[PDB]
Each structure stands twice: as structure tokens, then as C-alpha cells.
Amino acid sequence: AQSVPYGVSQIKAPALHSQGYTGSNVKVAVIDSGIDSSHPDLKVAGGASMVPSETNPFQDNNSHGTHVAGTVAALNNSIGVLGVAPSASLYAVKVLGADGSGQYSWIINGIEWAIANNMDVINMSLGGPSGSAALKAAVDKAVASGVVVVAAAGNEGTSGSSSTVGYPGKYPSVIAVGAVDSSNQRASFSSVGPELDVMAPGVSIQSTLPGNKYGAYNGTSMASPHVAGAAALILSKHPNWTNTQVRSSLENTTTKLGDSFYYGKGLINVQAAAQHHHHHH
């Protein structure tokens, strides 16, 4: 039997599924540690590896990329869990190895591959404490090419009145996503600051794990894919909306939560976003 993770229902994704919008024909790149393409609850459309020692993008030696991928698109059937956009065309862009780390050049290489392969949405459940001009250029180029770019805000908690949002989440071209629980309370680990854009479920999130397994993880890594999947649902209903319009529909239809420094615009509501009438984009 299939179980729908609380976070998928919390952002109102099944409302869109009941109208026939499931992310069909929308290309989402999960830039991460690979995706176990053999999982019965996942369908991987393609991929590429930028990790020198791990050429196969369909072998996830860490587990994180498979869990992130299940939040975006675990299949709608009678087993396991349910993704936000269960019909999305899922791409495994491996830029992190078994130890969960990657050089900045490998992440940039994956972004360049995603742009060249016409991805509609990029999810980056990853980050580092320092930026680089090359990393900023890559995410800016993806957005200038029309791609919706989503990233985890970071798990650095608070630090007085200063931002703790990491990179690439800190760049204004990226949608930086923080983590709430089932009660809409910010997780204490969730990064904060002016650059935080929206929140999504990131506490005790059930998803797919390698080897036909399922399990729960915590983090802004788990929140990000709810937003990347939500962007794919919106594009399946509105294929002509630009990335600018998808982003504004998600940010301007949230359920307002706490102060913007800690919660950004609030919790995404993909049902409201998909019904949004734009006045500025």
C-alpha cells in the first residue's frame, strides 16, 4: 500500500493531481548524489555524472539523491510513497560522490549540462559556506535561459541578525527553501536571512532510499524538492508560464507564517500558485 508523506499533502499537491496535473512532460534535474534508477517507486528519464570516480549517475552510493528524487517524483501507484510531481521527467545529475561532497566545478558542470539538456526545473539540495563567481554565473545563466532554480537554504540555524543562508541558495537568482514541520514551525536547524524565500516540509520526511527501501530524513534538502516538484506541477498546468511567472506564483500565494527573516514568504501552496493571476510578471 502507498502512503502519502505528510509534506506532499501539506503543500496541496494532491489537489493538482486530482485535476490531472502531475508534472507530465516537465523535465526536473536533481543535481545531487545520483538517483537509484532501479527503485520500483521511481522512473528516471535520463542523467549524467560529473563525478570523476563515479561515471554511473544511476547508482546512488550515498542515499541522499534518491531520497530527494522521491520527494520530487515518487510514482503514484500501490507501493511506497507519492512524489509532489509523480509524472515528472526525472533526471539524475550526479555531482556528489558517495561521501556526499563535490567540488564546485562538478556542481557547475551539472548546471551546464542541465541548461544544455533543456531542463525546466533544477533542484539543488546542497550547499557550501562560501560562494564563487563561477557558481553565481552558472545559476544566473540557468535562470537567464528560462530554468526554475531551487535550492536548500542551508542547515546553519541562527546567528544574531546575520544571514546564515549558504551557497547557491544565497544568490538572488535562486529560490532558497527553508524547513518547517507538520505544524508549520520552522525547524531550529533551518538557515535564516534576507535571502530565504519560501518554506516547505523538511522534518521527518519519508521518501525513497536505494535498494527498494523507504525512510525519513530531516533538512532543508528535504524542503527544496517539494518546491521543485511544485514548480513542475505548475508548468504542467501552465506550460507557457515563464520561470519568472512560476517563481512569482509560488512566492505570492504562500500561507504567511512568521517573520520573513525566519520564514521568507511562508509555506508554499501549489494549489493556490496554480490558480494565481499575475499582475506584475
Binding site: 548524489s33 561521501d99 564546485y104 539540495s125 546542497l126 557550501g128 525547524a187 536547524f189 528535504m222 527544496s224
Partner: protein, 63 residues
């Protein structure tokens, strides 16, 4: 104890000894400083980022 500023500059062996005394179930992993990492939050994990001399390059912290 969740952060170890006193270990910046120590060797990996020295840092692991102190962290395990303070946090016996710590899941320690060593990585090159200047990398990008997964953003899941693991309360039992302590990543050690090292420089070109293999010394702790940044303040170790749980997560």
C-alpha cells in the same frame, strides 16, 4: 557540546579523539575544505573539513 573551535588547525587524528570524547556516537567523516555537501541534517554527524596539510580547516560542528 556541538561545536569545536579549539580544534581548527589540529590533525584529523587529534580532532577525532576530542570529538569522540565529547560525543561518543559521533559519525565523523573527513572531506576537503571548499566542497559542496548534501543539506540533510544529521544530529549525530560531525563533518571535518581539511586543508592541504590535512589539518582541520574550519570549525567542526554537528549536522
Amino acid at each position: 557540546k556541538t561545536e569545536w573551535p579549539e580544534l581548527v588547525g589540529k590533525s584529523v587524528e587529534e580532532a577525532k579523539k576530542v570529538i569522540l570524547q565529547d560525543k561518543p556516537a559521533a559519525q565523523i567523516i573527513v572531506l576537503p575544505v571548499g566542497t559542496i555537501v548534501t543539506m540533510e541534517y544529521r544530529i549525530d554527524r560531525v563533518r571535518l573539513f581539511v586543508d592541504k596539510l590535512d589539518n582541520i580547516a574550519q570549525v567542526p560542528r554537528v549536522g
